[PDB]
Amino acid sequence: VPDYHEDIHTYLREMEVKCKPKVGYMKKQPDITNSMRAILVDWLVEVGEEYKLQNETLHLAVNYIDRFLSSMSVLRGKLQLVGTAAMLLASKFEEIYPPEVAEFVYITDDTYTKKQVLRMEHLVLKVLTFDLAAPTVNQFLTQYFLHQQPANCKVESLAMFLGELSLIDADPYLKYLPSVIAGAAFHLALYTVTGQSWPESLIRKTGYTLESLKPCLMDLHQTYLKAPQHAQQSIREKYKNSKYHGVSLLNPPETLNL
């Protein structure tokens, strides 16, 4: 049905501001670097594939991790326990039949006890003040795809891939709201596949002019280019698959003509 789509967009747009992590938190974390987090997020992509989880789960998990770190000092040896609990909560929130805790214990090479993971879950919930219904780059792409004419999976599959890549690198992608990263993702994917641009309808829906997306769109184009060199390679592997139309093997355009 159409009647709610508009109300939902404006709601998510309102909510994404609220459920958003502090921009410059990593510098205030005295024992974790952006790298350490990149390594964690990429691992969660591996976890996601291993348990055939929705991409949305991953996207949530990342938001939980980021907001958690936004207010709790965490030591490096405990970062994975944070990552794990978040993936468990994201799974419980999103998935139809979530994976057994015993199994989130199992994927950490038993670095943590079953009792450790469960206690972390309760602490994540506390810090996040139970607010798990977060807007994601994924939720925003879903809304944008309705504006396609017609639906083009390669475009969607590329946008998904592009927006997923954004999760890994806290620098620069904490700068931008999910709705923006999604908008940048969408145009870049559409431009690569069909040669078209950020459509007039979506400008009206979002309020984002293409020029307003430029900054983000500049960084995303770079991430896309340097994708095969990046130290984290799980997503590129994930999106080589025939299911996702092998989008990660499509050559980025060298200039964006902006």
Partner: protein, 295 residues
């Protein structure tokens, strides 16, 4: 948790036990929802809290506080006296007056409209998840199977949802939910307040499907484009004829039927939204009457 006095059990269910309780310090009367704690916090409890916390509305139950211990987790609700099912059972002889049925439906539709416009599907609307007070309010409760649909919600292969209020698209095995399934449920509840009897009381999935058919006809490709393709459709399905809605809901005016037929529309895409139904002629004269409830 020590500032609360338990008064009595007022609800049952698989999700947990619900007690009426009193705040010893402020005097406020509440409904406590207990959950024992081994797979960590139950998924249903995780969804129920995080979602209710967004939805502040007069026709959605107010989650007042969540109190988390190590070994127990309590959800603190504003108190409401009884549910719609218990009221319906009690109105068996006398009937629920149409002015009140309208009132209830109107509010139900307002709760659902607010849910759906905040990307929340209830998924399990049935008379027991709907709470009424002595003053004329009715509110959507139990959000354990509720879902956020920023991304479209895939349907479970073993639908744990109630059988009688289940939408045809689910029973026919569609891939995703949509707001349409919540409207269907309400439709069935609306008919039930009118008829004093359950509209589609099936035994199994196929009995539930057949009961829907005997009344509204067996859908074809004309009335529902793509129905034949759906995974759980069968060619060997009987072709039942659509029944006269005056014989299905006798004491309902033309608008009432107009509205009911629209909530019970076959194609989920053409089925009325909660938002639209509020504008339907049926509600032009809507009031807010008080029900006569029992202890």
């Amino acid at each position: 948790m020590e500032n609360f006095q338990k008064v009595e059990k007022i609800g049952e269910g698989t999700y947990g036990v619900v007690y009426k309780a009193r705040n010893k310090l402020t005097g406020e009367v509440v409904a406590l929802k207990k959950i024992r704690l081994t797979e960590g916090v139950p998924s249903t409890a995780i969804r129920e809290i995080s979602l209710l916390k967004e939805l502040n509305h007069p026709n959605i139950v107010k989650l007042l506080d969540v109190i988390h211990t190590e070994n127990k987790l309590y959800l603190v609700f504003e108190f409401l006296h009884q549910d719609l099912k218990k009221f319906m059972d009690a109105s068996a002889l006398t009937g629920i007056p149409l002015p009140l049925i309208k009132s209830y439906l109107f509010q139900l539709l307002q709760g659902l409209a607010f849910c759906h416009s905040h990307r929340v599907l209830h998924r399990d609307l049935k008379p027991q998840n709907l709470l009424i007070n002595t003053e004329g309010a009715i509110k959507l409760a139990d959000f354990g199977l509720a879902r956020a649909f920023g991304v479209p919600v895939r349907t479970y292969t073993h639908e744990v949802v109630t059988l009688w209020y289940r939408a045809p698209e689910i029973l026919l095995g569609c891939k995703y939910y949509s707001t349409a399934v919540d409207i269907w449920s309400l439709g069935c509840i609306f008919a039930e307040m009118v008829t004093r009897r359950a509209l589609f009381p099936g035994d199994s999935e196929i009995d539930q499907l057949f009961r829907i058919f005997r009344t509204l006809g067996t859908p074809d490709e004309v009335v529902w484009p793509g129905v034949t393709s759906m995974p759980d459709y069968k060619p060997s399905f009987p072709k039942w004829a659509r029944q006269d809605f005056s014989k299905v809901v006798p004491p309902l005016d033309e608008d009432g039927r107009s509205l009911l037929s629209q909530m019970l529309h076959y194609d989920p895409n053409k089925r009325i939204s909660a938002k639209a139904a509020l504008a339907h002629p049926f509600f032009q004269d809507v009031t807010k009457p008080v029900p006569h409830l029992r202890l």
